[PDB]
Ligand binder design. Structure first.
Ligand SMILES: *[C@@H]1O[C@H](CO)[C@@H](O[C@@H]2O[C@H](CO)[C@@H](O[C@@H]3O[C@H](CO[C@H]4O[C@H](CO)[C@@H](O)[C@H](O[C@H]5O[C@H](CO)[C@@H](O)[C@H](O)[C@@H]5O[C@H]5O[C@H](CO)[C@@H](O)[C@H](O)[C@@H]5O)[C@@H]4O)[C@@H](O)[C@H](O[C@H]4O[C@H](CO)[C@@H](O)[C@H](O)[C@@H]4O[C@H]4O[C@H](CO)[C@@H](O)[C@H](O)[C@@H]4O)[C@@H]3O)[C@H](O)[C@H]2NC(C)=O)[C@H](O)[C@H]1NC(C)=O
Ligand code: XRT
Ligand code: CA
Ligand code: NA
Ligand code: NA
Ligand code: ZN
Length: 805
């Protein structure tokens, strides 16, 4: 119930929300059907439109007007935004040459530069160049301020997941808004774009920026605008709030536009109908900047122009139907479109088996335009699994396509020509970031970055302590003139042991064998030096990784590689080695095919054994440092140490062997040497965080050897590739992966072909940030470089995406 008989007199766009049944006058009252009877009359005035004209200049004030051109309008804070241009001979902001904003130039009584976030739905990154001729205000912001060539959204690349990620710094799996449509089986409730359930606070996790601000005594504008409020009135409302007395005036504001998304769905991303919505958004930006210039705030406010996701060409005819695959299509519920999510239609159906559904959807048609996954098997970079609202079965849909349950869903719902939602590395999904103002840099291009990083920056811009989030605070310091956040490196928690030779060969009863009983004072001291770390500077280029949790581990040195060997998990946590451009690849010699050698530095009780592998008919083993890249026949024996062995399914060994034998040398050739750090990951509860021992669900049969869920590698070289990776004076370049450790290659439909036709494709799909590996391992990399720590944080957030220009 709402008692709509109250009045909005003196309350238009009030900031504090009044509770039912009292009627409302805030910018969301329309959405709740709760506005006072006189809200339209008083708060949504439209008389005479949005612009001053010559004949209106100096007019007697008429309070009916949408905005004013009377001499008193500046003091009232309600001039039309073009008032000073039309009436006082001033220039539009866009026509002024840009001039560096070295210091905030704020009116008296301003305690900090305000922040205005100007958010645009469906604003594809390439619009900044392709539309630049029709967006002069936006082009001025971009060229004069700080901009990225694009900003990477979160998956799914839908509106509500992304706008809430922007507001909280969190992945959708953590903030809870995992789609525009959701079912929560604990609540037994459904969230939809249409209707009232979406207003219930129980859906919305984390702590969005407006709450962070309020909790720390920084006043916020209300960020949400009912759709019927015209953009011109949104801009005027912001400018009016900026005229409030100091103690009442917010410090942070948000504007939102439903365009260009609205038109992009109808016309496609580059439909000729798209030029007008881009012109109109630019015009709104110009209104805001002119309005700020009127208030003498245009060199005081920090403005962020930011999108949620891009837009791809998608038409009704490019729809895959589950009814062409499943015998039992009426037994499932599908959330459809540019991603698929599948669950049982009935929880009383005991005949429901996700395994048979996945299998029926796997590589069944030559050109199949989606791929099914159990959510834990999705690329770890998507961070899209750890939430009860994410169905166990996910379909990753190819760009330009939809999935639907049956054909009747698509014509009893072609209209549309654009959509979004796909994998967040897809070029058409990328969106925009520009920051302009005193706290941003001047005429500065920054590399692409992820939207999860912005909350921390917005907090920095407002002097707020961010709530715990998934950004890496400091990684965007290079966007900022001032207000940088200068983190300290985390403290190492576990110090390594450095074991010497402590065990005799006969103490080991591991069931292993090796043809190494082949026999010099010259070379003997030299090999002792290698075991004490004489080559470590060559192979550990950025310091040893720090272990940020409590555990027992040993540093093991060798001619060709260094490792941190876990006595708890019976295998290395990391293995580090450098491969120069000149390195040669060799075979595993015949006599060494099945060689595994006890490590006399590590007790039998803290070693793996070969017998467990012999007896486990599903599980084989691989090596972290590759025997193929040994520096000499003699050094190759180190690569067969039991302390370099890790459990690998035979199907995964196909992947791993090709990476080690072919791809590492390829990368060294291309990048002028590479440093590689490889190791296992255990994430059985798919939370993106390192498992403890008691979370491990699978072991090599009969043994205490834990089976990794993934294998990672971090591949580092010099950004200036004229310098070799091991003699790099400046910034680094990295690419990494987190490969799923799976007993089949069903993910790769072409896996019957030579690895040259499918392995690198798999690896590209499972590309990762170093930060992703840090979360999954409790390790901290790049501890000892010549580089500034914030530069290293940026490097750790880098994702190599493998998309074209
Ligand atoms: C991305 O950044 C985020 C933010 O930093 C990281 O997420 C954090 O990770 C922590 C570990 O997973 C997690 O810490 C837990 O907090 C529990 C209390 O949580 C509540 O309070 C906080 C603070 O206000 C709040 O934010 C939480 O919000 C979650 O839950 C609500 C629903 O109530 C959602 O609306 C909201 O979206 C959010 O959901 C997300 O997180 C939860 C987990 O909290 C997931 O289940 C969801 O799927 C979703 O992803 C909560 O309101 C606290 O109880 C935990 O403590 C347990 O474990 C510790 C180990 O240290 C142990 O000491 C305790 O014994 C305890 O165990 C007991 O409970 C067990 C479970 O019932 C039981 O099995 C045991 O036997 C014990 O009884 C724990 O400390 C933190 O909540 C989240 N925060 C957020 C916002 O998500 C995230 O990891 C980053 N991601 C990456 C990849 O780095
Ligand atoms: C038809 N209208 C809609 O669909 C409203 C959708 N919508 C608008 C906002 C808030 N405004 C945009 C915004 C978001 C973050 C920041 Br930081 C700054 C501005 C929002 C936040 C979460 C989820 C959905 C959201
Ligand atoms: Ca985990
Ligand atoms: Na085996
Ligand atoms: Na296959
Ligand atoms: Zn859309």
């Amino acid at each position: 119930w709402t008692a709509t008989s109250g009045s909005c007199k003196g309350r238009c766009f009030e900031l504090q929300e009044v509770g039912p049944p009292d009627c409302r006058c805030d910018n969301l009252c329309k959405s709740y059907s709760s506005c006072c009877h006189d809200f339209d009359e008083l708060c949504l005035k439209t008389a005479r439109g949005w612009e001053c004209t010559k004949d209106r200049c100096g007019e007697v004030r008429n309070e009916e007007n949408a905005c004013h051109c009377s001499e008193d309008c500046l003091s009232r804070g309600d001039c039309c935004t073009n008032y000073q241009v039309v009436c006082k001979g001033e220039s539009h902001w866009v026509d002024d040459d840009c001039e560096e904003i070295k210091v905030p130039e704020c009116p008296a009584g301003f305690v900090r530069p305000p922040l205005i976030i100007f958010s645009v739905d469906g604003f594809r990154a390439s619009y900044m160049k392709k539309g630049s001729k029709v967006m002069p205000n936006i082009e001025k912001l971009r060229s004069c301020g700080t901009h990225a060539p694009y900003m990477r959204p979160v998956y799914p690349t839908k509106t509500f997941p992304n706008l809430y990620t922007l507001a909280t710094g969190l992945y959708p799996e953590s903030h809870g808004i995992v789609g525009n449509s959701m079912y929560d089986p604990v609540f037994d409730a459904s969230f939809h774009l249409r209707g009232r359930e979406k207003f219930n606070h129980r859906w919305w996790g984390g702590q969005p920026l407006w709450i962070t601000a309020t909790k720390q005594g920084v006043r916020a504008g209300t960020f949400f605008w009912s759709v019927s409020i015209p953009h011109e009135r949104r801009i005027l409302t912001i400018l009016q709030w900026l005229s409030l007395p100091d103690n009442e005036r917010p410090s942070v504001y948000a504007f939102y536009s439903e365009q260009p998304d609205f038109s992009g769905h109808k016309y496609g991303p580059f439909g000729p109908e798209m030029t007008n919505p881009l012109r109109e958004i630019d015009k709104t930006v110009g209104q805001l900047m002119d309005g700020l210039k009127q208030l003498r705030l245009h060199r005081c406010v920090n403005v962020i122009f930011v999108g949620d996701h891009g837009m791809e060409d998608v038409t009704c005819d490019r729809t895959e139907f589950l009814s062409n695959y499943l015998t039992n299509v009426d037994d499932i519920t599908l959330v459809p479109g540019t991603l698929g999510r599948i669950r049982a239609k009935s929880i009383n159906n005991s005949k429901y088996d996700p395994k048979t559904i996945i299998a029926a959807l796997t590589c069944k048609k030559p050109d199949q335009h989606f791929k099914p996954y159990m959510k834990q098997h999705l690329p770890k970079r998507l961070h899209y699994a750890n939430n009860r609202r994410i169905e166990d079965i996910h379909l990753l849909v190819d760009r330009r396509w939809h999935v639907a349950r049956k054909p009747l869903d698509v014509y009893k719902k072609c209209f549309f020509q654009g959509d979004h939602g796909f994998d967040n590395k897809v070029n058409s999904m990328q969106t925009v970031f520009v920051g302009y103002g005193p706290t941003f840099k001047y005429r500065t291009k920054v590399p692409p970055f992820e939207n999860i990083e912005l909350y921390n920056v917005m907090c920095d811009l407002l002097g707020l302590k961010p709530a715990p989030n998934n950004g890496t605070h400091g990684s965007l310091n290079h966007l900022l003139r001032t207000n940088t956040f200068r983190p300290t490196m985390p403290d190492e928690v576990s110090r390594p042991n450095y074991p010497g030779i402590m065990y005799l060969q006969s103490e080991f009863d591991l069931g292993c064998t090796c043809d190494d009983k082949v026999e010099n004072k010259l070379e003997e001291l030299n090999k002792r030096l290698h075991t004490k770390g004489s080559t470590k500077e060559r192979h550990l280029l950025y310091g040893r990784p720090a272990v940020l949790y409590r555990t027992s581990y040993d540093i093991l040195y060798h001619t060709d590689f260094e490792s941190g060997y876990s006595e708890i998990f019976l295998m290395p946590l990391w293995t580090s080695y450098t491969i120069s451009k000149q390195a040669e690849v060799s075979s595993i010699p015949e006599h060494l095919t099945n060689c595994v050698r006890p490590d006399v530095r590590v007790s039998p009780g803290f070693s793996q054994n070969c017998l467990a592998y012999k007896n486990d008919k599903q599980m084989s083993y691989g090596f972290l440092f590759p025997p193929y890249l040994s520096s000499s026949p003699e050094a190759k024996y180190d690569a067969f140490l039991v302390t370099n062995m890790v459990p690998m399914y035979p199907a995964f060994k196909r992947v791993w062997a090709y990476f080690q034998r072919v791809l590492v040398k390829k990368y060294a050739s291309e990048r002028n040497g590479v440093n590689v750090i490889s190791g296992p990951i255990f994430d059985y509860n798919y939370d993106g965080l390192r498992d403890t021992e008691d979370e491990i669900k699978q072991y090599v049969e009969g043994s205490s050897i834990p089976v990794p869920t993934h294998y990672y590698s971090i591949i580092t070289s010099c950004l200036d590739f004229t310098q070799p990776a091991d003699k790099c004076d400046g910034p680094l370049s990295v690419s990494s992966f987190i490969l799923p450790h799976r007993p089949d290659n069903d993910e790769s439909c072409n896996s019957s072909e030579d690895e040259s036709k499918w392995v690198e494709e798999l690896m590209k799909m499972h590309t990762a940030r170093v930060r992703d590996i840090e979360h999954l391992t409790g390790l901290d990399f790049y501890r000892k470089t010549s580089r500034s720590y914030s530069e290293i944080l940026t490097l750790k957030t880098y994702l190599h995406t493998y998309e074209s220009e």
